[model samples]
Target: VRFDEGSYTNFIYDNKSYFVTDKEIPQENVNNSKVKFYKLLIVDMKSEKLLSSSNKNSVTLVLNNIYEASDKSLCMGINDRYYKILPESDKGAVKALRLQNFDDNFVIDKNDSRKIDYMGNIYSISDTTVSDEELGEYQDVLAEVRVFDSVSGKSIPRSEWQSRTEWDYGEIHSIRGKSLTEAFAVEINDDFKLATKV
Candidate 1:
């Protein structure tokens, strides 16, 4: 995947509470169910570095796709983890976004300014198993970045992309009858938790 040298936007997030949501619920039995949720963080589309240490840029999201149940069929218990989006100094160029255990190539080509589709369960609630062209355009940050059109060479309001509804769970009713959909879907607020403390 190629990154426009100055086109990337950094998504910032932090924890206001340790547990995702202390809201209580009754337990129930289900074969296999799942749900998705997200925390709305400020996006830094104005920075050339795509990230910084300012109060608005303090945290970044890390994609978590691990399943923790003893039974392999169970969905991942709850929220995916988050961390400060770290950038690596490359000596003569702008810093690189360092994604741990991430093996995809992130080439920076000034000649190309195509859209970068944010894939997987973390950034979107859409099914990642589908091909890139098949993914939805209105799915959270994936949708926002598209609206901003990062590589357009046009600057827009830094305040325009600010999001409200700090944290929200995706509708669980979508996957109600699947065998892989489990009880955790209804009980857990599968939002994000900080991987590192602020």
Candidate 2:
């Protein structure tokens, strides 16, 4: 005679790994299992050394959780050297910029003056002696050659430039872009300066 139970086990356990009884396998285990059968390989072909030699390698550094305001502050630096700030607006856009002299000290030039152009246009500045017209001319020249974008390799639009604010006081430089991606490039001879990731 033989003794047998009528009940059957709905969740079967096999020698091979598989999902059973609606229980999910942990992600780590799944990944390990995959590698156990098939390995992943990566290669760098360039002869250049993998590590950076210096900290001043031109790079972009992003800061988050910044204090918010009517005007967002966007500062540009090259290899650590400070540049200028963007103009102010009630509805300011996101900002970005390329770097050139990444190691130079950048401080607000407060002694500088605002100036007017030959065309009678007002210009912005931290300087006190500069005229509206002179400031305008300086901005004209600056607008002619500021970097705008890196990936697109484009210059920022002059129309996008705005006025500086009191909060902008003591700020070495700041600029606003229509979008974070639209920020100007750091340029050399009208071309974008190459930068490394910070």
Candidate 3:
């Protein structure tokens, strides 16, 4: 897994994200589901960290995969909870874009970066077992996070999230899910909490 002077192994970190730098590799190979690469681009999710943080929340920044990130981004739900994409997302990509959590909130977000600093459900509807019609069922509910009440024994599906003021000290991290219903996906360090409603 080491990338020495033109020395790269057939190491493939499956189902994860990686950032590409100018550093070139001669004997490198990449397949759709597997790859053999060696570079200190942005993410290092698999290997141990020389310098790490006690910040599990750092895992929420949902990094934009290899594409025109200006168009889309990604994240995951640990069972019922969803999260905002963090700033150092390129680095967060190492955390794995395709999360292990299935049968639950995958990812959902909507953010008009020009209008407000918020993020709507980034990827919860199509990815998980939830229904799109339900997002409108509870139109009156306003928050930054949402989840199915099925986890708490509810009669039907539901979601919940938090919102914040513009006058906060953490504008960069002042990520809010404007809901359109009013949402923003912009964030520095995702604060607040993704609430759950039944």
- Quote each prediction's TM-score: 0.15, 0.15, 0.15
Quickly count the clashes in candidate 3.
Answer: 31
lDDT agreement of model 3 with the native:
0.23
Looking at model 2, residue 88 earns an lDDT score of 22
lDDT of 1 by residue, 1-198 (tens): 122343222222232111111111122322233333332222242232435343443334432322223332222122233222222211112222332211221211122212111111011222122222322222122112212244342323347642222222332221212111111111013432111101
Q: Give candidate 2's error at residue 73 in angstroms.
A: 6.7
> What TM-score should be assigned to candidate 1?
0.15
All candidates in order of lDDT, best leading: 1, 3, 2
> Where is the poorest 10-residue window by lDDT in model 2?
1-10
* lDDT tens readout by residue for model 2, 67-139: 1122332222212222223332310131222222111122212232221111112223212232222211011
Clashes of 1: 5
Task: Estimate the TM-score for candidate 3.
Answer: 0.15
| lDDT of residue 26 for candidate 1 | 21
After superposing candidate 1, which stretches have Cα over 4 Å from the reference?
Answer: 1-49, 55-59, 62-65, 68-198
- Tell me the spans in candidate 3 whose CA falls farther than 4 Å from its real position: 2-95, 99-198
Cα-based lDDT at residue 38, candidate 2:
16
